[PDB]
Amino acid sequence: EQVFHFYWLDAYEDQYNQPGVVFLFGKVWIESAETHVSCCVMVKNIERTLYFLPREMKIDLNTGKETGTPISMKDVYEEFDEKIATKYKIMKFKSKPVEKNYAFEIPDVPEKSEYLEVKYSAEMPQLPQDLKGETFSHVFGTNTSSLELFLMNRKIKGPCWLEVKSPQLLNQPVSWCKVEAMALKPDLVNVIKDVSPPPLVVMAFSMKTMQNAKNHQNEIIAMAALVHHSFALDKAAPKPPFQSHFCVVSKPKDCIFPYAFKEVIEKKNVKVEVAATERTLLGFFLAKVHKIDPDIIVGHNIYGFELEVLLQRINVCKAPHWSKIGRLKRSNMPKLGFGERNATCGRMICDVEISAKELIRCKSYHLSELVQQILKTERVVIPMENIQNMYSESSQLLYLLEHTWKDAKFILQIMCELNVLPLALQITNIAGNIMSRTLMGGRSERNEFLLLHAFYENNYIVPDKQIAAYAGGLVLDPKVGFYDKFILLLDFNSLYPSIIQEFNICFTTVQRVEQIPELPDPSLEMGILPREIRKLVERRKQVKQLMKQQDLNPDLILQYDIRQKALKLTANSMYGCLGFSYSRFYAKPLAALVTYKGREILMHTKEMVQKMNLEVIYGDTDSIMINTNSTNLEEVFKLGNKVKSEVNKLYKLLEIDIDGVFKSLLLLKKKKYAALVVEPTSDGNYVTKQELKGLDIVRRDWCDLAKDTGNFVIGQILSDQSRDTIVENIQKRLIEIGENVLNGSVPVSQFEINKALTKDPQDYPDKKSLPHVHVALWINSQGGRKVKAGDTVSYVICQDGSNLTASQRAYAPEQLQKQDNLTIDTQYYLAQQIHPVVARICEPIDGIDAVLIATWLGLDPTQFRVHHY
Amino acid sequence: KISLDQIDLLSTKSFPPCMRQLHKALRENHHLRHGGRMQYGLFLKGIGLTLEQALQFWKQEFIKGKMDPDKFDKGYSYNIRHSFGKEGKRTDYTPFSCLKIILSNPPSQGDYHGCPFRHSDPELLKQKLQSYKISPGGISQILDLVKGTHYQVACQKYFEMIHNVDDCGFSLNHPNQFFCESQRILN
DNA sequence: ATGGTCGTGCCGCCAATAA
Ligand SMILES: Nc1ncnc2c1ncn2[C@H]1C[C@H](O)[C@@H](COP(=O)(O)OP(=O)(O)OP(=O)(O)O)O1
Ligand code: SF4
Ligand SMILES: [Mg+2]
């Protein structure tokens, strides 16, 4: 007959508009053109499935009377046939009995029983979720989604090569793709595994807005994009990352182009087209997108501001064929990542900001910060108001266009360096969900889909969709002080997954109905959850084994570290999802049991270590710090090996390792310490590298000057010099800092304080007492670029002269040099930013106190202690 | 009625030794703990001081401690106002009874409030009474009563032989009552 | 839209019962 291969990448459905249909988009292979082109395939006649649980004894709907006659399967079939179907207008259906297993929170259900499986087309209406009858007690799967049902029936795990049997032509085209196909029923779709993924097309673009002066409105005047035609998802990023580019610029309205602009464009001879009005630019961009036909669109802040503004401009300008941005033919677009996702159906959207937030923790998530950190380069920021001024000179317009092109290139380079696409593809292929949803972030969806696949593969029934709370970890009491001898640190490898595998914690094994359920019997077989977490554990172990390879590229090591951290986070999120109240698999008792087992393990380890006449000073739910009180590395290494062997002798799956050896440790409080880590290099020699954990310096809500002073103090304290000289050095440094602060030689950029926003700025009732929300309000009201939830705000405290409190005198850094009555409040920074950090850091050591710090800094000691004369 | 220039004399003449010690501690250290602050504020309200003079005295004493007025205003002005039933529930409070001061909320290190006849050590109480020009016979009687778990009658005898009266004529249940009885005879 | 434990900086609020 006829059969063609297919490689799907995305899916889409709409129950309200076209029930019982799923759209699949992807790539196809053409021999004549020897290249891959976009294609779409339609699958129809997707039918719902229902499971009726028969009642062991029928009961009337008035008093629950049982006559005495046992209930047979045919009785349930007749009850469904002559009662349910007639009332809800069900015409044609197919029914047959099957066997299923239920092991979830719904009670009054046997573990193994027969069910009445009835199937009918999605066109007929939907039965109520809580239907009850004479012969059946419950009904399952009333409102299952068509896409989910198709995916679980055909056993598809992420992108893969698909084979369509008996394709059918389409009378009327429905998509902008080159090739289309139609399948009558989902039973004709099969999956193969032994074909490498084909290359894809990646498009990166960015735009520059412009706020109208006459009325509060924004318009787009410039735009550029970069396109690569042979991007590969199974290898490294290609060099160069791009192969073609284009850019278009248009005037806002009132202003006209500078004279001889076209002559300068011809002199430059670059693929730049000047557009008369906004409509021409929008039409050109829409035509270019259709002609190029990209598969992945990558940009910055696409979901938050770019896509909504673009769609609004298209709507107000009434550009023809708005659907060309997506891959489907539609007439009216929705409006609120739901509305944007619906609008961009058929094309994958990747945001660099979301990926950066998910993978790498940084001080800020602006484009300039991302370029400064990931690429180690500086990006010039053009002020928004100056756009109008620079529109009268050809050179300034060319500079703006080049800046836009450079921004697009920076975005593409960041995306290629972070290796977001292969990681997302691997995560999707592991979980089995839609990969386009993976790029949106979040961990609940991946775990839910993984558990759904695991339960479906093992012939189970999954719960239908919907429409502090328990004891957690345990942290020992620290011994605050300063230590000079070698300090060990023993850590557990994947503590919670190891506990789950060891104790066979699973839904099927643990019996449950604020009490901790008893452990399952060891004779029972392994549960689904340990067998599913073992794959993630093995994958992480394989990645670590690849890490252990010597002589690797510096960037490859960082990429592997990112991959292994993502895998570890994904493995850990499985336990966390068990305590999510909104999760589909919510189960508090399992989380309570695993936390209790972890606490018991920690206590037993601490007691058994204490039994060997060793000092334990700290530990956080999986760790133990031992004060060996020695000075030679050989003896402490031997003792650590002996303790590791003694610990590992007891258990079968849990393991313990020497995470690190410290040379000197300063412990302040819980989850707050700093120490030198010993790393061997060669010939038995070792080097020391400083590190911090939980101190105030690593936080983002402190001025950079205080952070630098604290870092210097920590470095001086942990050194091997005599205790007398470090005090003098700290005193001299503090005196110099105090002199410099009052002198005014310190740069303004060192006084910035960064804070994050949880809710919208208009949702804060205490705006009069919160400085960051006040600065956000000011920048939103009197500025351009808008700040929303999840953004970061930088503010500086300045002297205003209004006799107000410090919390109400915050200002934007750009607001300082613009005005004249604002100046840096040196007293606040020297008395509430530098002094507290230094006083807290030097508290455990002797010879340094708050009064001495105040005297050294040049402040007035008549407030801190004094009193006694 | 009561001004700022005779509070020291009143403490030395009419106030019981506990509140005299609290006043001396406030004068010298220019600071007090929560128990002493509450006890002194309630007593000053009981004797007849109003909001304005109490606020003036407290802020003047805090200036002698060398903290800025804004710090005091945002730290303890609210507490002082609430002590007078002028904020929150606006419920007026009764000064702590002598029984509560003797028994309830015992002082700790750094606290100068409470009954000296029960909390202060007798060896330091000896020099304290020497500083109060107390006769040795009265000191011996007070020490004997303290050893006999007698506090109310001990302070009664203290008032008697500091007031040049053989019999006080009242039952000790409140330091405010103590001050009022002292003033009834003195004035 | 993964779980819990820990600390640091801003605010407002309370106790009391003779005569
Ligand atoms: N982000 C997280 N979400 C949920 N649980 C977490 C998270 N981080 C840690 N945990 C829990 C589960 C872990 O078993 C336990 C200890 O974590 P941690 O010490 O970071 O690593 P780990 O014991 O899983 O092994 P590894 O050292 O190999 O990363 O704390
Ligand atoms: S008996 Fe009462 S009034 Fe006398 S000293 Fe003790 S607490 Fe003060
Ligand atoms: Mg205080």
XYZ file of N, CA, C and O in Angstrom, chain A residues 585-679:
380
model
N -1.385 13.459 42.196
C -0.989 12.305 42.997
C -0.618 12.742 44.408
O 0.409 12.345 44.962
N -1.458 13.585 45.005
C -1.192 14.091 46.345
C -1.252 12.963 47.367
O -2.229 12.211 47.426
N -0.195 12.844 48.173
C -0.132 11.811 49.206
C 0.778 12.316 50.324
O 2.004 12.209 50.226
N 0.168 12.868 51.377
C 0.947 13.311 52.534
C 1.628 12.163 53.272
O 2.817 12.301 53.616
N 0.961 11.036 53.573
C 1.609 10.016 54.416
C 2.927 9.495 53.873
O 3.823 9.191 54.667
N 3.081 9.372 52.553
C 4.352 8.906 52.008
C 5.475 9.896 52.299
O 6.581 9.500 52.692
N 5.208 11.192 52.117
C 6.210 12.204 52.437
C 6.534 12.203 53.926
O 7.704 12.313 54.317
N 5.510 12.075 54.772
C 5.755 12.009 56.209
C 6.622 10.807 56.561
O 7.556 10.917 57.366
N 6.338 9.654 55.951
C 7.103 8.446 56.237
C 8.553 8.583 55.792
O 9.468 8.175 56.515
N 8.787 9.145 54.603
C 10.166 9.264 54.135
C 10.935 10.274 54.982
O 12.119 10.072 55.281
N 10.281 11.362 55.403
C 10.948 12.307 56.294
C 11.285 11.658 57.633
O 12.379 11.867 58.174
N 10.358 10.868 58.179
C 10.620 10.176 59.437
C 11.779 9.198 59.295
O 12.638 9.109 60.182
N 11.819 8.452 58.189
C 12.916 7.515 57.973
C 14.246 8.244 57.843
O 15.264 7.783 58.370
N 14.260 9.381 57.144
C 15.485 10.158 57.048
C 15.961 10.664 58.397
O 17.156 10.613 58.706
N 15.031 11.156 59.220
C 15.400 11.614 60.557
C 15.947 10.469 61.400
O 16.934 10.638 62.128
N 15.311 9.297 61.322
C 15.793 8.137 62.067
C 17.186 7.724 61.608
O 18.044 7.384 62.432
N 17.424 7.737 60.295
C 18.741 7.396 59.769
C 19.787 8.381 60.272
O 20.886 7.986 60.685
N 19.465 9.678 60.246
C 20.412 10.684 60.718
C 20.728 10.487 62.196
O 21.892 10.556 62.607
N 19.698 10.243 63.010
C 19.919 10.013 64.434
C 20.782 8.781 64.671
O 21.710 8.814 65.488
N 20.486 7.679 63.977
C 21.261 6.458 64.178
C 22.713 6.659 63.765
O 23.633 6.217 64.465
N 22.940 7.338 62.636
C 24.305 7.613 62.200
C 25.041 8.488 63.206
O 26.204 8.220 63.533
N 24.381 9.535 63.711
C 25.019 10.407 64.690
C 25.380 9.643 65.955
O 26.484 9.799 66.487
N 24.464 8.808 66.452
C 24.748 8.047 67.664
C 25.900 7.075 67.451
O 26.800 6.971 68.295
N 25.902 6.361 66.322
C 26.945 5.366 66.097
C 28.300 6.032 65.886
O 29.332 5.488 66.293
N 28.320 7.213 65.262
C 29.573 7.951 65.134
C 30.044 8.447 66.496
O 31.236 8.355 66.819
N 29.130 8.973 67.317
C 29.489 9.402 68.665
C 30.023 8.247 69.500
O 30.823 8.465 70.417
N 29.592 7.019 69.203
C 30.064 5.858 69.952
C 31.562 5.628 69.793
O 32.164 4.946 70.630
N 32.182 6.183 68.752
C 33.598 5.975 68.483
C 34.480 7.086 69.045
O 35.609 7.262 68.573
N 33.988 7.832 70.036
C 34.751 8.899 70.688
C 35.216 9.949 69.678
O 36.405 10.254 69.562
N 34.258 10.504 68.941
C 34.518 11.570 67.987
C 33.493 12.678 68.185
O 32.349 12.432 68.574
N 33.920 13.908 67.916
C 33.096 15.089 68.121
C 32.291 15.397 66.866
O 32.849 15.515 65.771
N 30.977 15.526 67.032
C 30.065 15.904 65.958
C 29.567 17.314 66.241
O 29.043 17.585 67.329
N 29.726 18.208 65.268
C 29.432 19.618 65.480
C 28.330 20.155 64.573
O 27.771 21.220 64.879
N 27.989 19.469 63.484
C 26.972 19.988 62.578
C 26.475 18.875 61.668
O 27.101 17.819 61.544
N 25.334 19.134 61.032
C 24.739 18.222 60.076
C 23.366 18.690 59.641
O 22.586 19.167 60.471
N 23.044 18.564 58.348
C 21.763 19.035 57.813
C 21.095 17.892 57.047
O 21.195 17.800 55.822
N 20.431 17.012 57.797
C 19.511 15.983 57.314
C 20.207 14.874 56.532
O 19.607 13.823 56.285
N 21.458 15.085 56.140
C 22.220 14.014 55.511
C 23.710 14.050 55.818
O 24.441 13.210 55.287
N 24.191 14.974 56.645
C 25.617 15.208 56.793
C 26.026 15.104 58.255
O 25.203 15.226 59.165
N 27.319 14.868 58.463
C 27.923 14.837 59.790
C 29.313 15.448 59.690
O 30.124 15.022 58.862
N 29.588 16.446 60.526
C 30.897 17.085 60.589
C 31.642 16.546 61.802
O 31.150 16.646 62.931
N 32.823 15.982 61.568
C 33.621 15.345 62.609
C 34.872 16.177 62.842
O 35.610 16.479 61.897
N 35.111 16.546 64.098
C 36.314 17.280 64.485
C 37.377 16.257 64.859
O 37.491 15.856 66.020
N 38.164 15.831 63.867
C 39.154 14.785 64.103
C 40.281 15.258 65.012
O 40.996 14.428 65.586
N 40.459 16.572 65.148
C 41.473 17.167 66.017
C 42.885 16.708 65.665
O 43.708 16.482 66.558
N 43.184 16.565 64.379
C 44.491 16.134 63.907
C 45.111 17.218 63.030
O 44.542 18.294 62.827
N 46.300 16.920 62.503
C 46.997 17.854 61.631
C 47.618 17.200 60.404
O 48.204 17.913 59.583
N 47.512 15.884 60.249
C 48.056 15.185 59.095
C 46.922 14.596 58.265
O 45.968 14.034 58.808
N 47.033 14.735 56.943
C 45.953 14.311 56.058
C 45.810 12.794 56.015
O 44.704 12.282 55.806
N 46.908 12.060 56.202
C 46.844 10.604 56.111
C 45.968 10.013 57.209
O 45.118 9.152 56.942
N 46.157 10.462 58.452
C 45.388 9.911 59.563
C 43.904 10.233 59.431
O 43.052 9.363 59.653
N 43.575 11.475 59.071
C 42.171 11.849 58.933
C 41.537 11.118 57.755
O 40.368 10.724 57.812
N 42.300 10.905 56.679
C 41.779 10.147 55.544
C 41.499 8.700 55.932
O 40.463 8.136 55.556
N 42.410 8.082 56.688
C 42.189 6.711 57.141
C 40.977 6.622 58.060
O 40.170 5.689 57.951
N 40.835 7.583 58.976
C 39.677 7.589 59.866
C 38.382 7.760 59.085
O 37.378 7.097 59.375
N 38.383 8.651 58.091
C 37.205 8.818 57.258
C 36.851 7.559 56.492
O 35.677 7.205 56.376
N 37.861 6.866 55.961
C 37.602 5.605 55.269
C 37.013 4.566 56.216
O 36.076 3.844 55.853
N 37.554 4.472 57.433
C 37.033 3.513 58.403
C 35.582 3.821 58.754
O 34.735 2.919 58.804
N 35.272 5.099 58.988
C 33.903 5.480 59.327
C 32.967 5.218 58.153
O 31.832 4.762 58.336
N 33.422 5.507 56.931
C 32.607 5.251 55.748
C 32.295 3.767 55.608
O 31.157 3.385 55.315
N 33.302 2.913 55.814
C 33.070 1.474 55.745
C 32.097 1.021 56.826
O 31.193 0.217 56.564
N 32.260 1.538 58.047
C 31.369 1.153 59.137
C 29.930 1.560 58.845
O 28.995 0.804 59.130
N 29.733 2.755 58.285
C 28.385 3.202 57.947
C 27.802 2.347 56.829
O 26.660 1.879 56.913
N 28.579 2.123 55.765
C 28.060 1.422 54.596
C 27.865 -0.068 54.838
O 27.179 -0.722 54.045
N 28.453 -0.623 55.900
C 28.256 -2.043 56.176
C 26.801 -2.366 56.497
O 26.326 -3.463 56.180
N 26.079 -1.432 57.120
C 24.739 -1.736 57.617
C 23.726 -1.861 56.483
O 22.928 -2.804 56.454
N 23.739 -0.923 55.542
C 22.680 -0.809 54.550
C 23.044 -1.534 53.258
O 24.182 -1.958 53.046
N 22.044 -1.670 52.386
C 22.203 -2.379 51.119
C 22.285 -1.418 49.936
O 23.065 -1.635 49.004
N 21.482 -0.355 49.960
C 21.419 0.586 48.848
C 21.983 1.957 49.182
O 22.509 2.629 48.289
N 21.885 2.392 50.435
C 22.408 3.696 50.814
C 23.931 3.680 50.814
O 24.560 2.661 51.112
N 24.525 4.823 50.477
C 25.972 4.958 50.422
C 26.383 6.267 51.076
O 25.618 7.235 51.100
N 27.603 6.287 51.604
C 28.166 7.463 52.256
C 29.556 7.705 51.684
O 30.291 6.756 51.390
N 29.904 8.976 51.495
C 31.191 9.341 50.925
C 31.740 10.566 51.640
O 30.998 11.349 52.238
N 33.060 10.723 51.569
C 33.734 11.884 52.140
C 33.571 13.041 51.162
O 34.310 13.148 50.181
N 32.589 13.908 51.424
C 32.294 14.998 50.499
C 33.458 15.976 50.398
O 33.794 16.437 49.301
N 34.082 16.306 51.523
C 35.204 17.228 51.502
C 35.910 17.246 52.838
O 35.362 16.834 53.864
N 37.146 17.734 52.806
C 37.982 17.864 53.994
C 38.327 19.336 54.161
O 38.875 19.959 53.243
N 38.009 19.891 55.326
C 38.273 21.293 55.605
C 39.598 21.459 56.339
O 40.031 20.581 57.090
N 40.243 22.602 56.108
C 41.475 22.963 56.800
C 41.194 23.865 57.997
O 41.841 23.745 59.041
N 40.234 24.775 57.857
C 39.796 25.651 58.934
C 38.353 26.044 58.669
O 37.999 26.378 57.534
N 37.523 26.008 59.709
C 36.096 26.263 59.571
C 35.646 27.264 60.623
O 36.014 27.147 61.796
N 34.851 28.242 60.199
C 34.224 29.211 61.091
C 32.715 29.031 60.983
O 32.124 29.315 59.936
N 32.096 28.556 62.060
C 30.668 28.262 62.087
C 29.970 29.338 62.909
O 30.269 29.510 64.095
N 29.040 30.055 62.277
C 28.325 31.138 62.946
C 26.994 30.666 63.526
O 26.787 30.715 64.742
N 26.092 30.201 62.670
C 24.765 29.761 63.088
C 24.359 28.583 62.207
O 25.184 28.031 61.471
N 23.087 28.200 62.278
C 22.582 27.121 61.441
C 22.560 27.557 59.981
O 22.121 28.665 59.661
N 23.044 26.681 59.098
C 23.099 26.942 57.658
C 23.917 28.191 57.338
O 23.660 28.876 56.347
N 24.912 28.494 58.173
C 25.759 29.673 57.993
C 27.166 29.311 58.459
O 27.424 29.238 59.663
N 28.068 29.089 57.506
C 29.448 28.767 57.834
C 30.326 29.051 56.627
O 29.843 29.131 55.494
N 31.622 29.201 56.886
C 32.625 29.388 55.850
C 33.879 28.611 56.220
O 34.300 28.601 57.380
N 34.476 27.959 55.227
C 35.628 27.106 55.480
C 36.464 26.998 54.214
O 36.004 27.296 53.109
N 37.707 26.562 54.397
C 38.638 26.311 53.306
C 38.573 24.838 52.929
O 38.679 23.967 53.798
N 38.402 24.565 51.640
C 38.285 23.204 51.131
C 39.637 22.776 50.578
O 40.268 23.519 49.816
N 40.080 21.583 50.960
C 41.365 21.050 50.524
C 41.142 20.212 49.272
O 40.326 19.285 49.271
N 41.867 20.539 48.205
C 41.768 19.809 46.948
C 43.149 19.329 46.525
O 44.022 20.160 46.228
